[PDB]
Structure 1
């Protein structure tokens, strides 16, 4: 979504969680933080919905 965006992902702002140990705990922390970042993106999408055909 950051390096090769496809739809409108270049018009939203969010962070990418990164781990440092490569174990299960770090991946769990990454997934929780990704849920938080997707909440952020959802807020931005709700505010910037344009009109027009579908």
Structure 2
């Protein structure tokens, strides 16, 4: 598991004959379960920031690059 996939509830569809029809039923079920995961993500999405705070690896805010010297240096070096 990666990201928050281990905090979400969804089933894994498994086939029985291996033919083209099972690949289709599973391709239906994987999309119903994707709808389920989307609903859970919408309901449980928290508040906060959307990027890592290590601005040595992430771009500064456009209001901070035009107001702080180190933020402008980080922007210049990153871009």
TM-score by shorter chain over 0.5: yes
Moved over 4 A (4+): none
Partner residue in 2 for 1:25: 21
Q: Which runs of 5+ in 2 are unaligned?
A: 51-79
Q: Which runs of 5+ in 1 are unaligned?
A: none
* Structure 1 residues 10-37: Cα deviation after superposition (integer angstroms, max 9, x where no partner): 0000000110000100000000000000
If you compute each CA radius of gyration, which structure gives the higher value, 1 or 2? Answer: 2
Partner residue in 1 for 2:38: 42
Question: Considering only aligned residues, what root-mean-square deviation do their CA atoms show, in Å?
Answer: 0.4
TM-score (norm 2): 0.62
